[PDB]
Design an enzyme around this catalytic site. Structure first.
Site, PDB file in Angstrom:
ATOM      1  N   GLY B 146      19.368  42.936   1.239  1.00  0.00           N
ATOM      2  CA  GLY B 146      20.343  41.966   1.703  1.00  0.00           C
ATOM      3  C   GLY B 146      21.128  42.105   3.003  1.00  0.00           C
ATOM      4  N   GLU B 254      26.118  18.465   8.404  1.00  0.00           N
ATOM      5  CA  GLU B 254      27.503  18.147   8.325  1.00  0.00           C
ATOM      6  C   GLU B 254      28.320  19.377   8.032  1.00  0.00           C
ATOM      7  OE1 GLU B 254      28.522  15.520   9.302  1.00  0.00           O
ATOM      8  OE2 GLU B 254      30.500  15.188   8.605  1.00  0.00           O
TER       9      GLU B 254
END
Ligand SMILES: CC(=O)O[C@@]12CO[C@@H]1C[C@H](O)[C@@]1(C)C(=O)[C@H](O)C3=C(C)[C@@H](OC(=O)[C@H](O)[C@@H](NC(=O)OC(C)(C)C)c4ccccc4)C[C@@](O)([C@@H](OC(=O)c4ccccc4)[C@H]21)C3(C)C
Ligand SMILES: Nc1nc2c(ncn2[C@@H]2O[C@H](COP(=O)(O)OP(=O)(O)OP(=O)(O)O)[C@@H](O)[C@H]2O)c(=O)[nH]1
Ligand SMILES: Nc1nc2c(ncn2[C@@H]2O[C@H](COP(=O)(O)OP(=O)(O)O)[C@@H](O)[C@H]2O)c(=O)[nH]1
Lengths: 427, 440
Positions: B146, B254
């Site tokens: 990760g 957005e």
């Protein structure tokens, strides 16, 4: 696929083999996978093909076995829990077993220490990616003490990538040998500095506190002490290996507990110690389980960790409890233990959880860690060494085996500074 | 049409998807719900011809999809005894490279070797269909796969796909956590997203979730298997909602602009105000617009980001199910009516509000309500500005101070990866702070 290398040496190691491994046709042993999902079987095998790869999971027992004096042969091979297996077993052909580091390590072991290469090779190959090197071993073992460091050294030498996991047995204020002061000190320079990644402790003088406080046992036993350890290994070896929601592979084990290079040594506990009868207290608790994981009294080692601060604490719980529950509880440990936490270091405690509670506890707790305390486990063998072996000297015995002022002086000074360097943290 | 591409990264990620992918379980998918009759495992939907991965079917019938496992562990789950969910074969990667915790490992080391094959998967995956307008990354702030793997997998994806802002999820350390590695370590994983790329990110603060579970819902006992739903659900709002037909809709593009106030990757918070108990009695129903406030409550707050500190910044709220227009315009006003919200000096009616349908999905008792009114607060407030400090006090002392790298070097580069990650993620602290500390 994180497969696995089994190396069992000496007395403590071979016998200890007896008790780790049998806790395994509990079924997960070391890296197959499967089996253990819907019971069944048992013994020293199953149904397939042999060799080797059925390792510690279905049809086979994979291990590398190393005995140096035909004590492990007969003690387990035969009537006992195994087969073992054939071809995977070392019997030293009488080497005569040696007390003395220099002795199977320099002497009979070299010759076998080479025959232990073939075992390692075949296992290594297995078609799986091996991530453990598991070794039982004995301070004061010679066979184990100085044969285990031979075995360890080549394995770090040839397998740098694969951090070694070594189980340890130690010196506590009680004794075996007299040469075990120094025997395990030379077993040291090699256990730090010898590719052994992390290092377990199993003091037999501390194992008793456990098998007798926590436990009641009325009269322990050396076989019963083998129940203890299985605990400390299954968490590490099975746990995280076996399924799991945060899972720690063995390598998490080497970054979690070592915060630096010299061989970080640890202490480990199993809580669920329980009392047969007392069986009735705290339904396999977490706090229960956290509680028991720090106490001065539940550590299955010869340091009483309370004197000082731990540097790294790796704990593992595999009961099917909350992943929120274990992590929320471990904090409380950390705050009434400040001084037990290393000011460097945040996140002083790591927690792992696996998904199957030990066959028949219902809910488990394994613990790992290094504190400042060990400046102890050694400032004891060293006081021992300087005044013992290196002292007015006790190595004529070893002096024939082939070590001359060396392996003594170097083992005190290198293992020494261990004491100073270790302390360095938190003085 | 505007698909997302869904990438997992680590333990935190393969599961988290299970929360994402289960939460989907309503006939939606990354960006194509353009509809399906199947249900369940999807088994019952049919087999039209086909083979691994499905030509017969769209992402709809089967997913947007890409799991990276650097250990079989979690992936064996999702693969696990056809774990009840067969969501496809061959959208999983399972690397038996043996897992590595290190930003360095997997990211520099084993990951390099299998970030590619993955890149290939992604690419093919990035191609079957049209409009991918999104990349989702599940990330931790600790898990070798990760950090470096993601600083690898985000980095390559940013480099390769500059136009497609990545969205990544996070599960960051706080006061409690795992490893010692993660005080720095995630630091390292924080450098990389950053200017490698990335867009807006989101987190679930694991120390926030189990908190909100203890202050807002009930079950102090709780398992991570449940914390994933709190975070699982965050997504459903972000993608399933904005990705499904409704009023005022914010797409993944957005999300980028509304959160992003300036360009050093920015971070966001997730608030899910609907969180009612199985043991509640919300005032038969919980007031829709109170839901908005639910957001601000420091309490829904996923992270330990004391808003106390500073002025929010970007505030993006996504409301779904039975929401009323006059609820938003008129409840959202209210917030900007308390003292506290202290929006920034250049916030201009900061609040971005979307409405989505249907409803709040749910499943099972662990799922709380059937609440029929949702608030998702995605914000950029000064706070963040302090959790990274937190990680930076840790780092100045855990890694660099006296150094915990000897594991890590083992896997790859020294003296930056560390030094560079502190100085670049640092100024983050100063620059961030200066984003909201004076009128200028
Ligand atoms: C270990 C343990 O929990 O030993 C104790 C002694 O003090 C420990 C606390 C336990 O609560 C207690 C007392 C139990 O009551 C428990 O119900 C139980 C379990 C969990 C068994 O243990 C298992 O089934 C585990 O799966 C155990 N299996 C185990 O020990 O298997 C052996 C084959 C080594 C025995 C194990 C532990 C951790 C990881 C993996 C396995 C071992 C038990 O015999 C028992 O041990 C004893 O009565 C006893 C007496 C003297 C010596 C040893 C054990 C066991 C039984 C079946 C009773
Ligand atoms: N909330 C939440 N946190 C999770 C979950 N899975 C993992 N985490 C967190 O992720 C962090 C790292 O988890 P690990 O499983 O150690 O990560 P990893 O993928 O194993 O790490 P590596 O071995 O380096 O690849 C820990 O702090 C966990 O708490 C989950 O499903 N939910
Ligand atoms: N735990 C445990 N300790 C043992 C066992 N056998 C011996 N020991 C201990 O370990 C020390 C060394 O014994 P052993 O392992 O035979 O030594 P070595 O083989 O000569 O190195 C002894 O002094 C004992 O205290 C055993 O089966 N289990």
């Amino acid at each position: 696929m994180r497969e696995i290398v089994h190396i069992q040496a000496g007395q403590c190691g071979n016998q200890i083999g007896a008790k780790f491994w049998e806790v395994i046709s509990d079924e997960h042993g070391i890296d197959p996978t499967g089996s253990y999902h819907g019971d069944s079987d048992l013994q020293l095998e199953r149904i397939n093909v042999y060799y080797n790869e059925a390792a510690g999971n279905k049809y086979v027992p994979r291990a590398i076995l190393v005995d140096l004096e035909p004590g492990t042969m007969d003690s387990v091979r035969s009537g006992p829990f195994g087969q073992i297996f054939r071809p995977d077993n070392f019997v030293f052909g009488q080497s005569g077993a040696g007390n003395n580091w220099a002795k199977g390590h320099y002497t009979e072991g070299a010759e076998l220490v080479d025959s232990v290469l073939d075992v390692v090779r075949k296992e290594s190959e297995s078609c799986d990616c091996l991530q453990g090197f598991q070794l039982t071993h004995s301070l004061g073992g010679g066979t184990g003490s100085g044969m285990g460091t031979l075995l360890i050294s080549k394995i770090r030498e040839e397998y740098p990538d694969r951090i070694m996991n070594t189980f340890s047995v130690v010196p506590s204020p009680k004794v075996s040998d007299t040469v075990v002061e120094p025997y395990n000190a030379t077993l040291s320079v090699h256990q730090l500095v010898e590719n052994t990644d992390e290092t377990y402790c199993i003091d037999n003088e501390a194992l008793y506190d456990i098998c007798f406080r926590t436990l009641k046992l009325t009269t322990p036993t050396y076989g019963d002490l083998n129940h203890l350890v299985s605990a400390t290994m299954s968490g590490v070896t099975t746990c995280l290996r076996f399924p799991g929601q945060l899972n720690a592979d063995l390598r998490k084990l080497a970054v979690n507990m070592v915060p630096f290079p010299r061989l970080h040594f640890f202490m480990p506990g199993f809580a669920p110690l329980t009392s047969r009868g007392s069986q009735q207290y705290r339904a396999l608790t977490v706090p229960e389980l956290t509680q028991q994981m720090f106490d001065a009294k539940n550590m299955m080692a010869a340091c009483d960790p309370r004197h000082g601060r731990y540097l790294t604490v790796a704990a593992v719980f595999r009961g099917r409890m909350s992943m929120k529950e274990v992590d929320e509880q471990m904090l409380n440990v950390q705050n009434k233990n400040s001084s037990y936490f290393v000011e460097w270091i945040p996140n002083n405690v790591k927690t792992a959880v696996c998904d199957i509670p030990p066959r028949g506890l219902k809910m488990s707790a394994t613990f790992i860690g290094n504190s400042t305390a060990i400046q102890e486990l050694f400032k004891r063998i060293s006081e021992q060494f300087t005044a013992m072996f290196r002292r007015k000297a006790f190595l004529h015995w070893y002096t024939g085996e082939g070590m001359d002022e060396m392996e003594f002086t170097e083992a005190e000074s290198n293992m020494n500074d261990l004491v100073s360097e270790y302390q360095q943290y938190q003085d | 049409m505007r698909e997302c591409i869904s990438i997992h990264v680590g333990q935190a990620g393969v599961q988290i998807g299970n929360a994402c992918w289960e939460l989907y379980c309503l006939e939606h998918g990354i960006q194509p719900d353009g509809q399906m009759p199947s249900d369940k495992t999807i088994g019952g939907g049919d087999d039209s011809f086909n083979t691994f991965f499905s030509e017969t079917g769209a992402g709809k019938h089967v997913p947007r999809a890409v799991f990276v496992d650097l250990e079989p562990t979690v992936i064996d789950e999702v693969r696990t005894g056809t774990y009840r969910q067969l969501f496809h074969p061959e959208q999983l990667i399972t690397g038996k490279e043996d897992a590595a915790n290190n930003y360095a490992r997997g990211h520099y080391t084993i990951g390099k070797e299998i970030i590619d094959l993955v890149l290939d998967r992604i690419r093919k995956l990035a191609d079957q269909c049209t409009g991918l307008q999104g990349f989702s990354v599940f990330h931790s702030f600790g898990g070798g796969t990760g950090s470096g793997f993601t600083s690898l997998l985000m980095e390559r994806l940013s480099v390769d796909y500059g136009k497609k802002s990545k969205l990544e999820f996070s599960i960051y350390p706080a006061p409690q956590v795992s490893t010692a590695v993660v005080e720095p370590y995630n630091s390292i994983l924080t450098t990389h997203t950053t200017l490698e790329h990335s867009d807006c990110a989101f987190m679930v603060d694991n120390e926030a979730i189990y908190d909100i579970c203890r202050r807002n819902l009930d079950i102090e006992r709780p398992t991570y298997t449940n914390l994933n739903r709190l975070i699982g659900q965050i997504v459903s709002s972000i993608t399933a909602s904005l990705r499904f037909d409704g009023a005022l809709n914010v797409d993944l593009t957005e999300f980028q602009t509304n959160l992003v106030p300036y360009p050093r990757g920015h971070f966001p918070l997730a608030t899910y105000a609907p969180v009612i108990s199985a043991e509640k009695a919300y005032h038969e129903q919980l007031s829709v617009a109170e839901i908005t406030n639910a957001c601000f409550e420091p309490a829904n707050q996923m992270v330990k980001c004391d808003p106390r500190h500073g002025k929010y910044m970007a505030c993006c709220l996504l409301y779904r199910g039975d929401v009323v227009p006059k609820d938003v315009n008129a409840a959202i006003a209210t917030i900007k009516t308390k003292r506290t919200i202290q929006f920034v000096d250049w916030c201009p009616t900061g609040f971005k509000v979307g409405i989505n349908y249907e409803p709040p999905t749910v499943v099972p008792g662990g799922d709380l309500a059937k609440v029929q009114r949702a608030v998702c607060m995605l914000s950029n407030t000064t706070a963040i500005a302090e959790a990274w400090a937190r990680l930076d006090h840790k780092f100045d002392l855990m890694y660099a101070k006296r150094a915990f790298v000897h594991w890590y070097v083992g896997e790859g580069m020294e003296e930056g990866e560390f030094s560079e990650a502190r100085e670049d993620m640092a100024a983050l602290e100063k620059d961030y702070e200066e984003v909201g500390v004076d009128s200028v």
